[PDB]
Amino acid sequence: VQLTAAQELMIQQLVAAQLQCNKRSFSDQPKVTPWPLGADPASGSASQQRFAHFTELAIISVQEIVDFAKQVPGFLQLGREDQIALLKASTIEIMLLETARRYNHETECITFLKDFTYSKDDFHRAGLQVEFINPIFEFSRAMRRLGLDDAEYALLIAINIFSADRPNVQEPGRVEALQQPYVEALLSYTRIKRPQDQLRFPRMLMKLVSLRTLSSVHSEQVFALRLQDKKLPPLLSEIWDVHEGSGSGSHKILHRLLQD
Amino acid sequence: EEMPVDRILEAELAVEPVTNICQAADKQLFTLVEWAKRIPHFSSLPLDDQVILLRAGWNELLIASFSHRSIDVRDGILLATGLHVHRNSAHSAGVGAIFDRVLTELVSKMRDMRMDKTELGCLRAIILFNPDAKGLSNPSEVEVLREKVYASLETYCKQKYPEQQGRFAKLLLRLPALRSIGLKCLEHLFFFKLIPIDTFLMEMLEAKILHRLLQ
Numbered sequence A: 001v002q003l004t005a006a007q008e009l010m011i012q013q014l015v016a017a018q019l020q021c022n023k024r025s026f027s028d029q030p031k032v033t034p035w036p037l038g039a040d041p042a043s044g045s046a047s048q049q050r051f052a053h054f055t056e057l058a059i060i061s062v063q064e065i066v067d068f069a070k071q072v073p074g075f076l077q078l079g080r081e082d083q084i085a086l087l088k089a090s091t092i093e094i095m096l097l098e099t100a101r102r103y104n105h106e107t108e109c110i111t112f113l114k115d116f117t118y119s120k121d122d123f124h125r126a127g128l129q130v131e132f133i134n135p136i137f138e139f140s141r142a143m144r145r146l147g148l149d150d151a152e153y154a155l156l157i158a159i160n161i162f163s164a165d166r167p168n169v170q171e172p173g174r175v176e177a178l179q180q181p182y183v184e185a186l187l188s189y190t191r192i193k194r195p196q197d198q199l200r201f202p203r204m205l206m207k208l209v210s211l212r213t214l215s216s217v218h219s220e221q222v223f224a225l226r227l228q229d230k231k232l233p234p235l236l237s238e239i240w241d242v243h244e245g246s247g248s249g250s251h252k253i254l255h256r257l258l259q260d
Numbered sequence B: 001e002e003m004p005v006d007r008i009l010e011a012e013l014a015v016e017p018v019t020n021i022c023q024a025a026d027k028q029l030f031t032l033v034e035w036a037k038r039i040p041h042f043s044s045l046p047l048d049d050q051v052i053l054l055r056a057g058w059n060e061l062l063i064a065s066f067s068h069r070s071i072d073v074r075d076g077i078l079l080a081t082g083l084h085v086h087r088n089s090a091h092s093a094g095v096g097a098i099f100d101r102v103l104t105e106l107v108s109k110m111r112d113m114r115m116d117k118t119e120l121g122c123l124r125a126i127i128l129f130n131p132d133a134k135g136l137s138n139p140s141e142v143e144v145l146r147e148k149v150y151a152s153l154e155t156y157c158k159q160k161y162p163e164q165q166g167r168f169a170k171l172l173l174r175l176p177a178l179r180s181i182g183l184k185c186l187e188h189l190f191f192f193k194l195i196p197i198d199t200f201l202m203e204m205l206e207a208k209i210l211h212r213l214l215q
């Protein structure tokens, strides 16, 4: 029924952390392989460039997610093996939330960084597949209908991170205890934002179920990339278990990003 | 109410090593159809849609019912066949990991919450009314029915457990766990297919029995 000062300040902190993280990500825009311009050469290099472009965006996204996690109150009090385990599982899910958040229903395009705007077809030209692309856009549409503000998004991201059922979580009771305040805060926040719409909160929580499916749809996508001999960079291979060496986690790239 | 919690409770009550699980599955599939019919407004949907929902949900639905059934068991689950399965057996069959996830995330949580039957049925009705299932003639209709379950369930939770402010949320937060667990179990059912199976279960794993059975 009411929002605690503590609760207000926590939400404020999360929202602030996301903007701080977005700013850092925009700094890296010049770092990205330019999206090919003109008519595609027969060399086939435009395809490889589009795929590399998207892959680099994904990398930045992972960095952005790690930066954010570190600023979520509680996250740094967990063991480093669990921090890793929680991010491995949730990265794709958060990526999808952040993706939906950048969807425009008028252009039916998603905007990455400041002004990298891409349609469904662009996604396909980048080397992703329709079985993956279509759910992404369906999910964005669904999210847009919900009409979430920056605070609701941030909260949902935090909750998603503190899912105790992820693989290799050594201290699951600790993760559920962390999750609970963020859940309580979201209940309070949404019930104050929209008192005349009680369904808003369950609606949101149920998106965490959708995201489990989409995580799986994404696994089917990785399988197709291997099949097409598209190699992924270490970080993404590590986090999603794709290629021999990096996929086993022998590089500790995520460990390092946390270490900083 | 538009989705009476009573009628949902009636539906659960109205329904009373590896191969043993598949035997148990095939039999429960029949019971599941009878359960789904007792859920408000389910039979009112288009026949093709009733089919689609049961094909999409049967897996999570069965896992939920046997998880709750096993609340009294210690380090094991109780199948509808009457047979038990224990950790030691599960690890012997290379299915130990998924088995431990079920106990940790479902059976345990259900026990500690003292999740009641009404609560179970509502969760199962939520799973059942899945508007993201492909090929539905009207996803909106299905979305609306799920949303009524949200409302009825929350109402129930505030009435019967007024002291438990976060109980409703606690219930819903089992569903993501259940979805992921459902995907892994399905995986194993496909391995058994590739390597002594029953008829109805086979139809569910295939990309007729179900049609007749709800007419």
Ligand SMILES: CC(C)[C@@H]1CN(c2ccc(CO)c(S(C)(=O)=O)c2)CCN1c1ncc(CO)c(C(F)(F)F)n1
Binding pocket: A025, A051, A054, A055, A057, A058, A060, A061, A064, A095, A096, A098, A099, A111, A112, A113, A127, A128, A136, A218, A221, A222, A232, A236
């Ligand atoms: C398609 C979407 C879901 C993902 C992630 N995506 C992205 C998501 C969020 C954000 C915001 O933090 C950004 S960005 C560039 O930081 O604005 C990019 C960038 C590209 N993405 C991507 N996701 C998955 C894969 C492979 O599974 C690949 C690729 F194949 F390119 F490697 N790329």
